Nucleic acid binder design. Structure first.
Ligand SMILES: [Mg+2]
Ligand SMILES: [Mg+2]
Ligand SMILES: [Zn+2]
Lengths: 55, 227, 98, 110
RNA sequence: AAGGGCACCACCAGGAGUGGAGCCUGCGGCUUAAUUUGACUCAACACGGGAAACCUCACCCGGCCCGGACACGGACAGGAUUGACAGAUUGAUAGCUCUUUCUCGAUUCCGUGGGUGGUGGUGCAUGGCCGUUCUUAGUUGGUGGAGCGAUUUGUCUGGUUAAUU
């Protein structure tokens, strides 16, 4: 509060814009192919996403 | 046609939908023996199959719970109305499922008893359910203030190579006890035999089988049979 | 929370039409995605459903970043008494099909 | 039975005495669920928590006697977190702890 | 100590070097209101995917907000309360305060208990994940044998192999 200065700093581009879609953390974020997961959450969910360690 | 997504992004988004659906459905109906999900996507009304152990309480009273579950799925994932339907199937041989056995161990531990007794009971149930081998690990603040780990291996278990991708199955659970969490890790080696549903086909790569010959009698004096 | 009454009525009736409420956990979102015409921000939905949980009328679950809410039978009775609606109409999840 | 035992002890003896299981000791925390059932059970997979009504009853009874969670927990010889978990609908009920709370606050919880 | 075998994270035969110079970047120190913090032989130091103008952001200097559920009391349609134009005031077009009065309507406000959030502490309370011991060939039951026993044999003199092959 109030309305015209609460969230007024622009969260366009940059690390304050983007966050993990699982844990809402902002660091180590993989945004390739529109994953938008942090690297730890990606390692957790990569097998049932469809990514396999193959070589 | 109007809205388009490249195939890489499309397949990644499909995998992300499967992952989030599986995690939400794990978190929701864990006390019902969830044990995995299947999705059948089609360019029409899709289906999602829930492979529970006890389906009579996954379906609520007159199927109220399955109705509210398909409601929240359709409201979260932005499906159009009627394009998603949600099914339930009872899993056969619940003793061969790592997720169900890890949940059973969590249930026993939360109810409270010796960790030894619970792990022994789960292990022997897994063996007499038909597994080739099992391995149950419990780790955390056991009796004492310093953390230990205890494994209860039995039978047969492979660790390396490509056969351990499809021929065992694992599960990790956390148990929120009174003093920190315990970790549960259950691995079950599946049988091969029927080349059907209870296990996988294509047996272990270093297991050769040699068919036995027949009798092979009468190599004696020549005879000819005409027609 | 302040939440002028028409917003609370809107949130409650939408929870009553189908017995679920699927708001997303972020407070800086100017409209709920599917209310979106009654000028209801996401924060109001979050805090109203939190109050409903505290009285025990609604059970919640939490996915990755989303809230899910289910309306219990005490929730049916309370919403029925709050909306002054007659005691024969039901939410969609209670009965729509065979 | 007392009548049959005193009848047998006034004549030719056939009585049998035997020691109880937990006789002559104080187990401070009595177990709530029978481990014979809990080791046997494989199918049922859920634990019922305390209802919200029970937590509200504890809250109102405790607040009406000038008593806090710390003081109630110290009075019934438990940690404050188990009281705060009973009041918040999170803890699996224990009949022994529930009975201690009933004698502490004078209400009936079962 | 001896006897077998092995490895360019060992050596030999060498190649390209690094260590010297300018600069980039990471650590320590010093300085600072703050120069947030973890990691210190291999197994810390272009590592935390850590290329920070703001955000990130934890740290410093100031200033708003409640996003303090719920329960019980209190006060309350003769008003519980919510916003706000102008002046001052402020870094500020924060009605943040002060003057001034308008506006909203039971949602709030006050007290007690208690929620809730925390890139707050503790990795020497933990889970999971990872690294390392350890890139080598190693490890273990059952039944039998030996030994009072701890233990041992199986798992070996020899030849062979990248390998208890
Ligand atoms: Mg190999
Ligand atoms: Mg060297
Ligand atoms: Zn991820």
């Amino acid at each position: 509060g109030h309305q015209q200065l609460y969230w007024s700093h622009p969260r366009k581009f940059g690390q304050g814009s983007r966050s993990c879609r699982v844990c809402s953390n902002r660091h180590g974020l993989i945004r390739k192919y529109g994953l938008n997961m942090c690297r730890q959450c990606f390692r957790q969910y990569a097998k049932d996403i469809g990514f396999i360690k193959l070589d | 046609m109007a809205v388009q997504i490249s195939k890489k992004r499309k397949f990644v988004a499909d995998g992300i939908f499967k992952a989030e659906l599986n995690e939400f459905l794990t978190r929701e109906l864990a006390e019902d023996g969830y044990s995995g999900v299947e999705v059948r996507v089609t360019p029409t009304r899709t289906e999602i199959i829930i492979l529970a152990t006890r389906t009579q309480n996954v379906l609520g009273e007159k199927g109220r719970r399955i109705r509210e579950l398909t409601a929240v799925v359709q409201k979260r994932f932005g499906f159009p109305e009627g394009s998603v339907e949600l099914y339930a199937e009872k899993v056969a041989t619940r003793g061969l499922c790592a997720i169900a056995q890890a949940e059973s161990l969590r249930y026993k531990l939360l109810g409270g008893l010796a960790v030894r007794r619970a792990c022994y009971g789960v292990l022997r149930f897994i063996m007499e359910s038909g597994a080739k081998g099992c391995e149950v690990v419990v780790s955390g603040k056991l009796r004492g203030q310093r953390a230990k780990s205890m494994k209860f291996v039995d039978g047969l278990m492979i660790h390396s190579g490509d056969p351990v991708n499809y021929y065992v199955d694992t599960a990790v659970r956390h148990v929120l006890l009174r003093q920190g969490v315990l970790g549960i890790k259950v691995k079950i080696m599946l049988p091969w035999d029927p080349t059907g549903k209870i296990g996988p086909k294509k047996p272990l790569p270093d297991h050769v089988s040699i068919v036995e010959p027949k009798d092979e009698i009468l190599p004696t004096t020549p005879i000819s049979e005409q027609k | 929370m302040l939440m002028p009454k028409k917003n609370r009525i809107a949130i409650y009736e939408l929870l009553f039409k189908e017995g679920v409420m699927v708001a997303k956990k972020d407070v800086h979102m100017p409209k709920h995605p599917e209310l979106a015409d009654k000028n209801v921000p996401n924060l109001h939905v979050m805090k109203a459903m939190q109050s409903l949980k505290s009285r025990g009328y609604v059970k919640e679950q939490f996915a990755w970043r989303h809230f899910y809410w289910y309306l219990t039978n005490e929730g049916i009775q309370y919403l029925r008494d709050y909306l002054h609606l007659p005691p024969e109409i039901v939410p969609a999840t209670l009965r729509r099909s065979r | 039975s007392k009548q049959a035992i005193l009848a047998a002890q006034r004549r030719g003896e056939d009585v049998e005495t035997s020691k109880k299981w937990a006789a002559g000791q104080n187990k401070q925390h009595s177990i709530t669920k029978n481990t014979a059932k809990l080791d046997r059970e494989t199918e049922e997979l859920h634990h019922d928590r305390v209802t919200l009504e029970v937590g509200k009853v504890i809250q109102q009874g405790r607040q009406s006697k000038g008593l806090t969670q710390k003081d109630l927990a110290t009075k019934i010889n438990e940690k404050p977190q188990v009281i705060a978990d009973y009041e918040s609908g999170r803890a699996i009920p224990n009949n022994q702890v529930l009975g201690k709370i009933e004698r502490a606050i004078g209400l009936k919880l079962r």
